[PDB]
Design a binder for this molecule. Sequence first.
Ligand code: HJ0
Ligand code: HJ0
Lengths: 274, 287
Amino acid sequence: GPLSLSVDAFKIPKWEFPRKNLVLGKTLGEGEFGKVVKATAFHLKGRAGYTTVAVKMLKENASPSELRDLLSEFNVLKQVNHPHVIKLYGACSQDGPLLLIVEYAKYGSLRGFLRESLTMGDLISFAWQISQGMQYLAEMKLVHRDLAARNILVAEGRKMKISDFGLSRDVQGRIPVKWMAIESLFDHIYTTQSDVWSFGVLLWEIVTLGGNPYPGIPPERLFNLLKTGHRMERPDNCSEEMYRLMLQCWKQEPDKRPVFADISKDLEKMMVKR
Amino acid sequence: LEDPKWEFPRKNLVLGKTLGEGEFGKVVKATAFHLKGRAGYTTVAVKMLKENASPSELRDLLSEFNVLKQVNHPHVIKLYGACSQDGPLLLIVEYAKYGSLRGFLRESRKVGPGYLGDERALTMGDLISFAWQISQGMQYLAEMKLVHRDLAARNILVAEGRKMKISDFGLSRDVYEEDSYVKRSQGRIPVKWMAIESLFDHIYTTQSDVWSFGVLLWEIVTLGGNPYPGIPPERLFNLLKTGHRMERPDNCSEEMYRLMLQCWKQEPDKRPVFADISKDLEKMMVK
Ligand SMILES: Cc1cc(NC(=O)c2cn(C3(C)CC3)c3ncnc(N)c23)n[nH]1
Ligand SMILES: Cc1cc(NC(=O)c2cn(C3(C)CC3)c3ncnc(N)c23)n[nH]1
């Protein structure tokens, strides 16, 4: 089938990293996304000595869907280069488990980083960096699908990195209900404008310092609440202008939502006006 | 839609500790007041959506509910009811005091009297009985034109009297129309339990459940061993296609291993059906 074709083609120069030059270290995180470990990589992409990296691999008892997702991430990440998209350095396809080698983010996920915590200027900068990355991916005709604070990484210099491309598509449902657009929930449609909806939820997560969206509402009740026009209220320590941006990301009609260039512009205007 | 045969008052269900959490959802221990004619409280288990559930997880829980309303067997987990209205979907089922079969067998390695070659003492006779009970459950599910798809030791429960209960119907599908279920997209069943034709061709039948049953037999006789130990799942495509199968484990007769190998035949029509698996396990017990 499609996966067996992909695996064999993958197994068989620019991307293949010698397994002997990778020393896997401590586990950074585990879950349905897979397993990510810290590692050191000798002579990685022409760099002297050891480069500290993160390595993504399959969890125990991986399904075809999880293997397909990891191969899809490699395919996507080969083609993208942006300061706020996680950088692929290579893969190990010839020695034991499939490994993807990416840049290391020392502060972990944005959700984790915010929860352990920053000024409102920093939070607006974090939103802007992510919007810049998303504007780039939108221009490359990639729909990410899984935008959330857990899938943004915080690297050296508090630099945002979009990660977790396993659900991404070129332009059943495994995106959590609470980050999904209304058209995604009811009609199974995913576009850059549904990424904008998810970005709105991510913006709410940023201002709440890694809060849980729609707290107390189960996802099985959220379907009807979104159709009737209910949205999350303005949270504590959030300006009227920032909340206005969120609400526009959650417009029922996708054409009424901002594009990422509009989101980036809003955040640029905010930061100069401070 | 609310079915008064199954709908249970929310105020009558009290939830306790998490028994298990993962891809399947979340299962908690609970108690239910005035459940299905029983006066007072009854200890039960409740399956619910985990935190940050997706539409696929909700559809799977709804599908389990629909399946378990229609299927009844001494070796299938018993549905008692559901709380479906004005809140999270909670499925109320029979509590299995010993947990998963995988967990129960792994405990038998360290908990006396252990495996010997009362209910913590295990013999090969007991292991054959467990396999037989599961095969009886699967034979009935096959008559019901249901393919389970996710048969594994982690998804068999060990209840009072060490009675086997098939659980985790979230991936199960009806095959009444063509005797097969086919999915265009990639499945969510762990690779190491999948039939060759499921892995390559996305075809699921009762004969692909038979393959999975063979892997379950291997898990039973190894006291909860991990299939294809140390082999990455991406290597299974080549491994299976070239005719490789798991070797005869320690603690496995020739007859039992022949049954596993029969369950892993490349051609699905050469594999035994569940009625014959049941017969094979009966002949092993009596001798
Ligand atoms: C190919 C790919 C890799 C990836 N994800 C990460 O690289 C990372 C995930 N984490 C978490 C928060 C789980 C531990 C990381 N932590 C520190 N550095 C990191 N590069 C990561 N997505 N797609
Ligand atoms: C509708 C449904 C329920 C279910 N699963 C379980 O009810 C159970 C799962 N576990 C595990 C091993 C995870 C903790 C149980 N343990 C003790 N009793 C139990 N009834 C269970 N599948 N489908």
